[PDB]
Design a binder for this molecule. Structure first.
Ligand SMILES: CCCCCCCCCCCCCCCCCC(=O)OC[C@H](COP(=O)([O-])OCC(O)COP(=O)([O-])OC[C@@H](COC(=O)CCCCCCCCCCCCCCCCC)OC(=O)CCCCCCCCCCCCCCCCC)OC(=O)CCCCCCCCCCCCCCCCC
Ligand SMILES: CCCCCCCCCCCCCCCCCC(=O)OC[C@H](COP(=O)([O-])OCC(O)COP(=O)([O-])OC[C@@H](COC(=O)CCCCCCCCCCCCCCCCC)OC(=O)CCCCCCCCCCCCCCCCC)OC(=O)CCCCCCCCCCCCCCCCC
Ligand SMILES: CCCCCCCCCCCCCCCCCC(=O)O[C@@H](COC(=O)CCCCCCCCCCCCCCC)COP(=O)(O)OCC[N+](C)(C)C
Ligand SMILES: CCCCCCCCCCCCCCCCCC(=O)O[C@@H](COC(=O)CCCCCCCCCCCCCCC)COP(=O)(O)OCC[N+](C)(C)C
Ligand SMILES: CCCCCCCCCCCCCCCCCC(=O)O[C@@H](COC(=O)CCCCCCCCCCCCCCC)COP(=O)(O)OC[C@H](O)CO
Ligand SMILES: CCCCCCCCCCCCCCCCCC(=O)O[C@@H](COC(=O)CCCCCCCCCCCCCCC)COP(=O)(O)OC[C@H](O)CO
Ligand SMILES: CCCCCCCCCCCCCCCCCCCC(=O)O[C@H](COC(=O)CCCCCCCCCCCCCC)COP(=O)(O)OCCN
Ligand SMILES: CCCCCCCCCCCCCCCCCCCC(=O)O[C@H](COC(=O)CCCCCCCCCCCCCC)COP(=O)(O)OCCN
Ligand SMILES: CCCCCCCCCCCCCCCCCCCC(=O)O[C@H](COC(=O)CCCCCCCCCCCCCC)COP(=O)(O)OCCN
Ligand SMILES: CCCCCCCCCCCCCCCCCC(=O)OC[C@H](COP(=O)(O)O)OC(=O)CCCCCCCCCCCCCCCCC
Lengths: 443, 152, 144, 108, 546
């Protein structure tokens, strides 16, 4: 807590640096995100895996805002602290540095909060930052920014009275006493489903993602894909399943059909896309549908497998966004028809593209393979057909993945030259994390 | 009554307030659960968290039992060679029973009961054969198997 | 082949391309980019820290499966001989099957009931009376 | 034939120089007008939606049809799981008061 | 010696694709690849003699545990038993000669060391596949050979048809990979483990054998999955030899022989229909490599039926796999030498005479062709006659039709293989390019596979060779007469006037054309519906103009 105050105050000192010292501004904003990565690694060192489920607790009196660490929050916090310095390497202005610093404060505090009102306050305080990040004046899109902000606001406004309903019902929004009291679970369950089915892209409230994740800059796309979608999953695992479990059983056919149609229809839409960033953007919806069904199965080790799929997606899809961002930065287009023969002109970039293509399709020696196997073990244990639907549709994911790769990488060599040292080192931590988590993830 | 429930809650709060433990023991890996006659154990949060820790301990121990028995059964089968059909049925049965306990105890609210031996299926086939005999019609089902796997 | 044989000298000297598009200027060593010391310190100190978490934490502190592996082994030792004795006592086995019938279990699930003597439901059901009173006795003469 | 570096490093911008400097926009693509038009049209394809015969029929049989198929399959899987677990009929949303949430203290 | 058969081709691939190869060049990388295969073959020979003959299986815990969540436990463990030793000997011995051939065949390619590294990776993932003791490390090998097959089929990436052939192989195999994954889920759920030695099934739930059979039909290119196999000729000749002999197509048959959890009706029907279909397909082709590809599909059908017959049939199935790899790789290498001697032409109407090839290439084609058609007391005679005689005494009435289909297939095979020899050498010359290849490395590559053909006659694959299943002389010597009938018909070069049957068979029954619109175009159109009518239409929420 004292450490967190010191890290925030060190991060906020970027504004006071005079702008004529360019080197100092770059180094200060990069170190301001490097330090929380070290602190979260130390928190992993301090964790007792044979101890209590909630460790390193702190509660700030009668102000809500109570905090604690479990395994899902700790893995997601480690992933966020990895992803934020890479975002710092892709920005050039103090406005970008400050927006991403404020976003990192809000994400890190939202991932480990234990109060529902605290979760509401901390998460969607990032709405105006996302609006300004997506609708930036010369190269953004105001339509996309309006869509993402309005969908998130709609879901949050459905949740807010139900939050206050359980608060008047039992006397607290602390999740440890909300899980032990008697509450009207249908109303609160519908409010929580309303927020987290927009955060996780679940059809029909999913149309904001294709616009926002493409109109964003490369750093914004890395953040939005790798981090902000998983707040819906940790919302399911931390707040909704412990507090309204009767609802979570009774809504299972509806959540199940939403997940199945989201998976199938989003995979079918990904095949007709002609923009590389839109191809990468749609593929995330099917993965999150598998995550949601694995969470809702509650069957074998469902929290473990679903968290592991969230980590595998958060490693693999930001790297695909990084490669598309390199192509866009040095060729000024994201259109497939302008790219051919990238193997001959960018051999290192095409090799990285192929490896992350194989990772996104859940091939072995990548963490997505272990993730999808364990998620389908959790789904299979409820019924065999709910697993069969995901199993037989694997040709549809590989079709779009290999079609996009084969169209842009082979053929007549036209396009930009190979990657620089900076682009390679933006990609590199994700590759090392993927090789480790896909070969020896546990000990 | 309400007064007795209130006095029990006060006693539980006093006990869990003045609780300590040392010498190599982790709290939240308790040796025994707290036995109660409460309707809805979540009425008393300390008892609910204590029994939650005990139940987590048991799930992980059962997983470990499955691994130890799988190593033993592998040793038996690989030593036996082609004689494995009559030599290592008992250890295969014990491994399958341990997997059954590891899956079916504290299973969650949605997963079906896992039969590692096809034992529920063949038990059902026995009962359906017996019912079709008294019904005096042809059995539309297969006849029950004596053993389905290398264990059961 | 150059030189008239497979075993001659090679025929290329110089750069076979430029790695990362970097061309040496006047033979000088390459200038370090602004992020390189901080990148290597941050990500290397994360990688070494993750390695030390996996290879220098106590095993019980690293993973709960190391806490439960020795406790499962002794329970399995005192359960293997219980299962051995059950294969020699038909009266104990038929009493166990009667308890299995009372607990909505089938005859093949007799081995399972021995293996779940420490479960939360069995201890709480012995306390409440949902579990038949004979099961404790059967456990007692199977351990003896 | 530009010179953007001194012999000891030291990048030069070449703002007033005659020779064209190599920079970030050197490999930007030359835009084909028809490709840009087609991508613009596909970007705004929601203006081309119309409730004609084919749109209504395909939105009924494929979208609503497969959504109903997936709901029926989900209910089938839920009921079969509850039967193969020893449970009675369980209360889904809009199904009258019944059993939800099995008790861990109970043998089914 | 045991881990040297698996690690060390992977090491050769890692060396030849990394920036170490920037210091070796083509000349150094060829040396590295050939040596890294010679060591692995020597290790596999030691493993073969220890496990097959002296009967001592070896289990190695290699890299600890892979992942273990709940009761799902996957470990990095190998086990070297009889089937594993058989497969390792076959794979490494074929891949050594294919590497020695490819170091000379692809000499004028600009990226030679990349090609050699891809070949070594493909071999190493095959070794990982057969050396695994559980299902998940097997899936590592399965998808590894799938990926390396994609990289090698579409090697000449500037050609669009090669790229589309590689994508087609990936997609057709991805359907069966999905079914195989669901079958692994069934197996683990209802038996409790993933290791092969704990998977003893007497009576399972039907979906197990069916879904594992579909997953095997994908890799072994059976009926309704064979469509990728013919288009995989876009890759270079060493790729085709290694795909059709030792890697990839033999993996599904190995999996079914290992598990033995099938239901025999599906297996027998699929195998016999595949054998007859690929026999009539290869009889009506003029592309030299496509005839050999269809003969591979036909022999995989034979092995499928055999493993349907029983445990003895499973042993005969493994035996035919082992003897098939040697003469199939020899056939592809000889065909590559004939193609290179004729200026790259692959049409058998533009061959003839004995000037475009070496004496050893013609001898290799002749001997491998005689082993394939079941000429007496050669290598294929023993295994093929064993499968045919086991099919003639099966008590299943379904196997009666299967045996007739196999005998018709045997006559068709002796027809088109004799046609391949006749068009290539016996007729008058009708090409215009005579550049015969007489280099040392491809000739030694062919001589090694001919030595293995002799070895299979001298030392059998299993104990079935020499066992007499008691059949009358009429039933026993009929396949010899069918071989002679094929030879006489093909040398007479006779044809029929029923041109509509000829163009129905030569167009390969229209499977690709019917698949181009029965799933494929509907998938594209349903994507159009889900995007335009759903995302932009029914679910789209517009703006409020003011
Ligand atoms: C394999 C190759 C695929 C494409 C070729 C089609 C061959 C089909 C065929 O019937 O050709 C006979 C064909 C006769 O056709 P034809 O010479 O054009 O017509 C006969 C004459 O007009 C006049 O001849 P004829 O009247 O003197 O009698 C010849 C003919 C009978 O001719 C007739 O008059 C036809 C009347 C039908 C009943 C008798 O005799 C038979 O076919 C009797 C059975 C032997 O035989 C050949 O000359 C070609 C020989 C090549 C190998 C075929 C040997 C049989 C292979 C058995 C397996 C079948 C695989 C195909 C599966 C189908 C899909
Ligand atoms: C009061 C609504 C205020 C909140 C929404 C808002 O601000 O809408 C403004 C905005 C007004 O836009 P507009 O330029 O006046 O165009 C009106 C529609 O495009 C009208 O175009 P349309 O001819 O396609 O409308 C017929 C409409 C059929 O309309 C309905 O289904 C109305 C029934 C709604 C009652 C709830 C049950 O069918 C659909 O558009 C698809 C089925 C809707 C489900 O409304 C929309 O964007 C459409 C609203 C449709 C609601 C369903 C959305 C599906 C997700
Ligand atoms: C719900 C459980 C959490 C699992 C989430 C999945 C994690 C993804 C990766 C799997 C790694 C498994 C690690 C196992 C040993 C590590 C310590 C451990 O035990 O895990 C911790 C938590 O583990 C973690 O935090 C793992 C961190 C994984 C995140 C990795 C991604 C970030 C790295 C990015 C790439 C960096 C490259 C940099 C180099 C250049 C606690 O989990 P449980 O054992 O379930 O807790 C026990 C429960 N109870 C206390 C109640 C008894
Ligand atoms: C500036 C003074 C007034 C600021 C009031 C802000 C009220 C809320 C407005 C909407 C939220 C915007 C937050 C964005 C923060 C990140 C950012 O971009 O910071 C700014 C500055 O933002 C700040 O004021 C940062 C300090 C406040 C937050 C940190 C301290 C308290 C926690 C960086 O400078 P430029 O954008 O180049 O400034 C140019 C201004 N203009 C856009 C108008 C052309
Ligand atoms: C309004 C203010 C901004 C928004 C609210 C921010 C609230 C503070 C952040 C979350 C505080 C809890 C951190 C997580 C944790 O486990 O902390 C414990 C462990 O401490 C840590 O190691 C904290 C690490 C902090 C950084 C890790 C990420 C968390 C949030 C990051 C915020 C700053 C990020 C900066 C990014 C530029 C508590 O330590 P303690 O000694 O105070 O508690 C022990 C006991 O109960 C006594 O009270
Ligand atoms: C333990 C393993 C250590 C490494 C073993 C592998 C290295 C041997 C192969 C060397 C590279 C092969 C390419 C080569 O040497 O090419 C020549 C082929 O060399 C040969 O004679 C064949 C290679 C040696 C024999 C094969 C060795 C391979 C090992 C398997 C042996 C199995 C029996 C080209 O012809 P030449 O140089 O003889 O003639 C020159 C020309 O006419 C004028 O320009
Ligand atoms: C350098 C990596 C060397 C291999 C390390 C390795 O496999 O360790 C795993 C963790 O990975 C790691 O610790 C990788 C962290 C560093 C990233 C890659 C560099 C599992 O650790 P183990 O199975 O050896 O642990 C047994 C003791 N409990
Ligand atoms: C882009 C895709 C590229 C594909 C690459 C090829 C395909 C790879 C597929 C499988 C990858 C698995 C790699 C695992 C890495 C190490 C994991 C184990 C970590 C560890 O500490 O384990 C110890 C390390 O031992 C050792 O590592 C042995 C000790 C050193 C002696 C041998 C040295 C290795 C020589 C290898 C040559 C080249 C082979 C290429 C694969 C072994 O002990 P344990 O703790 O597991 O205990 C159990 C038995 N004692
Ligand atoms: C001229 C065209 C004739 C076609 C038939 C092939 C030559 C067979 C001659 C023949 O009549 O042999 C019979 C074979 O029939 C049989 O009993 C066997 C029928 C099936 C034989 C098909 C394969 C023939 C070998 C090539 C008698 O047989 P036999 O009394 O001489 O037999 C015992 C001595 N080994
Ligand atoms: C995603 C697609 C994935 C599916 C791919 C292909 C699967 C084909 C499956 C075909 C058969 C499915 C199962 C049906 C037979 C089994 C039957 O189980 O019992 C049903 C099921 C089981 O009955 P019980 O087991 O007796 O309770 O019956 C029900 O309770 C459901 C009955 C009503 C189903 C339709 C409801 C209307 C939904 C409309 C949705 C459209 C919204 C459009 C918005 C835009």
């Amino acid at each position: 807590m004292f450490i967190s105050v010191l890290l925030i105050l060190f991060a906020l000192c970027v504004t006071l640096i005079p702008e004529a010292h360019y080197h100092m501004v770059r180094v200060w904003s990069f170190v301001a995100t490097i330090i929380p990565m070290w602190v979260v690694t130390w928190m992993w060192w301090n964790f007792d895996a044979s101890g209590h489920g909630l460790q390193m607790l702190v509660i700030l009196g009668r102000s809500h805002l109570a905090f604690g660490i479990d395994g899902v929050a700790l893995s997601l916090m480690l992933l966020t602290t990895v992803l934020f310095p890479i975002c710092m390497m892709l920005l050039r202005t103090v406005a970008g540095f400050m927006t991403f610093i404020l976003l990192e404060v809000l994400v890190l505090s939202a991932l480990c909060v234990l109060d529902l009102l605290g979760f509401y306050i901390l998460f969607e305080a990032s709405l105006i930052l996302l609006f300004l990040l997506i609708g930036r004046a010369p190269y953004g899109s105001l339509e996309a920014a309006y869509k993402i902000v309005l969908y998130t606001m709609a879901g949050s406004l459905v949740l807010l009275p139900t939050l206050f309903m359980i608060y008047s019902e039992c006397g607290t929004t602390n999740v440890l006493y909300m899980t032990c009291a008697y509450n009207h679970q249908t109303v609160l369950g519908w409010g929580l489903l309303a927020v987290l089915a927009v955060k996780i892209p679940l059809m029909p409230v999913h149309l904001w993602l294709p616009e926002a994740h493409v109109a964003a800059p490369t750093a914004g796309s890395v953040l939005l894909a790798g981090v902000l979608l998983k707040l819906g999953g940790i919302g399911f695992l931390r707040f909704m399943l412990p507090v309204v479990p009767e609802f979570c059983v009774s809504v299972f056919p509806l959540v199940s059909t939403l997940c199945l149609v989201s998976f199938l229809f989003s995979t079918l839409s990904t095949l007709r896309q002609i923009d590389l960033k839109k191809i990468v953007a749609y593929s995330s919806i099917a993965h999150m549908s598998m995550v949601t069904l694995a969470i809702f199965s509650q069957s074998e080790f469902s929290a473990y497998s679903s968290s592991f799929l969230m980590i595998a997606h958060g490693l693999i899809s930001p790297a695909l966004f990084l490669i598309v961002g390199i192509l866009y930065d040095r060729a000024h287009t994201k259109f497939i028809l302008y790219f051919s023969g990238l193997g001959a002109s960018m051999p290192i970039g095409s090799t990285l593209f192929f490896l992350f293509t194989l990772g996104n399709l859940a091939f072995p020696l990548f963490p997505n393979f272990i993730a999808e196997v364990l998620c389908m073990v959790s789904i299979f244990a409820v019924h065999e057909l709910l697993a069969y639907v995901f199993c037989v549709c694997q040709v549809l994911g590989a079709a779009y993945g290999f079609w996009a790769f084969n169209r842009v990488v082979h053929g007549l060599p036209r396009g930009p030259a190979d990657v620089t040292r900076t682009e390679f080192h933006t990609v590199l931590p994700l590759l090392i994390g993927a090789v480790w988590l896909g070969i020896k993830p546990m000990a | 009554s309400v007064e007795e429930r209130q006095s029990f809650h006060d006693k539980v709060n006093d006990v869990f307030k003045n609780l300590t433990g040392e010498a190599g023991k982790r709290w939240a890996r308790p040796d025994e659960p707290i036995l109660h006659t409460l309707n809805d154990e979540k009425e008393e949060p300390h008892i609910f968290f204590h029994n939650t820790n005990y139940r987590t301990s048991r799930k992980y121990i059962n997983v470990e039992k499955t691994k130890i028995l799988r190593e033993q059964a592998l040793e038996c089968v690989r030593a036996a060679g082609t004689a494995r059909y009559h030599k290592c049925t008992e250890v295969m049965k014990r491994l399958q029973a341990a997997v059954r306990v590891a899956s079916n105890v504290d299973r969650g609210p949605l997963a079906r009961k896992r039969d590692v031996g096809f034992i529920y299926h063949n038990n059902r086939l026995r009962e359906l054969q017996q019912q079709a005999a008294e019904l005096e019609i042809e059995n539309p089902f297969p006849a029950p198997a004596k053993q389905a796997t290398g264990g059961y | 082949y150059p030189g008239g044989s497979f075993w001659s000298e090679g025929t290329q000297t110089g750069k076979n391309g430029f790695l990362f598009g970097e061309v040496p200027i006047n033979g000088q060593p390459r200038k370090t980019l602004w992020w390189e010391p901080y990148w290597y310190a941050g990500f290397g100190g994360m990688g070494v820290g993750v390695y030390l978490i996996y290879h220098a934490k106590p095993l019980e502190a690293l993973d709960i499966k190391y806490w439960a592996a020795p406790r499962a082994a002794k329970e399995l030792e005192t359960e293997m001989r219980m299962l051995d004795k059950l294969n020699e006592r038909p009266d104990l086995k038929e009493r166990l099957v009667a308890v299995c019938k009372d607990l909505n279990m089938i005859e093949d699930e007799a081995y399972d009931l021995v293996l779940m003597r420490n479960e939360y439901k069995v201890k709480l059901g012995m306390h409440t009376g949902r579990v038949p009173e004979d099961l404790k006795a059967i456990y007692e003469e199977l351990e003896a | 034939e530009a010179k953007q570096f001194t012999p000891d490093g030291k990048y030069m911008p070449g703002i007033f120089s005659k020779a064209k400097p190599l920079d970030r926009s050197t490999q930007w693509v030359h835009k084909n007008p028809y490709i840009e038009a087609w991508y613009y049209r596909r970007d705004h394809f929601e203006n081309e939606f119309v409730w004609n015969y084919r749109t209504t029929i395909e939105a009924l049989w494929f979208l609503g049809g497969f959504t109903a198929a997936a709901y029926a399959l989900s209910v089938f899987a839920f009921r079969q799981a509850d039967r193969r677990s020893g449970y009675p009929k369980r209360q889904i949303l809009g199904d009258e008061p019944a059993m939800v949430l099995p008790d861990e203290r109970q043998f089914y | 010696m045991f881990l040297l058969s698996v690690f060390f081709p992977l090491l050769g691939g890692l060396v030849n694709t990394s920036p170490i190869a920037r210091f070796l060049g083509h000349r150094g990388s060829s040396i590295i690849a050939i040596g890294c295969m010679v060591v692995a073959f020597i290790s596999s020979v030691v493993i073969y003699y220890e496990v097959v003959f002296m009967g001592c299986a070896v289990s190695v815990d290699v890299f600890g545990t892979w992942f273990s969540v709940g009761t799902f436990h996957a470990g990095w463990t190998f086990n070297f038993d009889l089937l594993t030793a058989n497969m390792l000997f076959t794979v490494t011995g074929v891949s050594m000669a294919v590497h020695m051939y490819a170091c000379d065949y692809m000499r004028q390619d600009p990226h030679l060391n990349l090609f050699l590294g891809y070949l070594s990776y493909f071999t190493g993932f095959m070794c990982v596949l057969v050396a695994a003791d559980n299902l998940l490390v097997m899936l590592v090998g399965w998808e590894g050979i799938g990926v390396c097959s994609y990289l090698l089929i579409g090697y000449w990436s500037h050609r669009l048809s090669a790229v589309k052939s590689a994508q087609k192989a990936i997609l057709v195999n991805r359907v069966s990979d999905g079914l195989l994954m669901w079958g692994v889920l069934w197996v683990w759920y209802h038996l409790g483990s993933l290791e092969y030695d704990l998977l003893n099934v007497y009576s399972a739930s039907g979906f197990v054998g069916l879904s594992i059979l579909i997953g095997a039909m994908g890799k072994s290119a059976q009926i309704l999955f064979h469509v990728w196999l013919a288009d995989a000729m876009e890759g270079p000749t060493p790729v085709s030899a290694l795909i059709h002999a030792a890697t990839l197509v033999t993996a599904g048959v190995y999996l079914l022989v290992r598990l033995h959890i099938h239901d025999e009706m599906f297996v027998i029907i699929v195998g016999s229909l595949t054998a007859f279909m690929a026999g009539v397909f290869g009889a009506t082709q003029s592309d030299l490599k496509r005839v050999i590809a269809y003969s591979t599909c036909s022999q995989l059908g034979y092995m499928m039926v055999s493993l349907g017959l029983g445990e003895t049939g499973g042993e005969a199935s493994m035996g035919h796999l082992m003897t098939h790899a040697s003469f199939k790789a020899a056939l592809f290498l000889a065909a590559g030498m004939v193609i290179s001697g004729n200026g790259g032409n692959q049409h058998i109407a533009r061959y003839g005479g004995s000037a475009h090839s070496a004496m050893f290439t013609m001898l290799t084609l002749m001997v491998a062709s005689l082993s394939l058609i079941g000429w007496p007391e050669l290598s294929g005679f023993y295994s093929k006659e064993t499968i045919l005689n086991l099919a003639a005494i099966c008590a299943d009435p379904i196997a009666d039709v299967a045996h007739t289909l196999l005998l018709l297939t045997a006559m068709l095979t002796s027809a088109y293989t004799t046609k391949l020899f006749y068009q290539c050498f016996m007729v008058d010359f009708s090409g215009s390019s005579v550049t015969p290849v007489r280099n040392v490395l491809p000739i030694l590559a062919m001589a090694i596979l001919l030595l293995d053909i002799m070895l299979k006659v001298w030392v059998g694959t299993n104990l079935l060779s020499g066992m007499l299943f008691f059949l009358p002389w009429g039933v026993k010597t009929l396949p010899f007469g069918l071989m002679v009938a094929g030879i006489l018909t093909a040398t007479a070069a006779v044809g029929s006037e029923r041109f509509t049957l000829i163009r129905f068979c030569g167009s390969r029954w229209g499977f690709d054309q019917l698949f181009a619109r029965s799933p494929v175009n509907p998938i594209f159109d349903l994507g159009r519906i889900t995007w335009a009518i759903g995302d932009r239409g029914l679910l789209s929420v517009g703006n409020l103009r003011a």
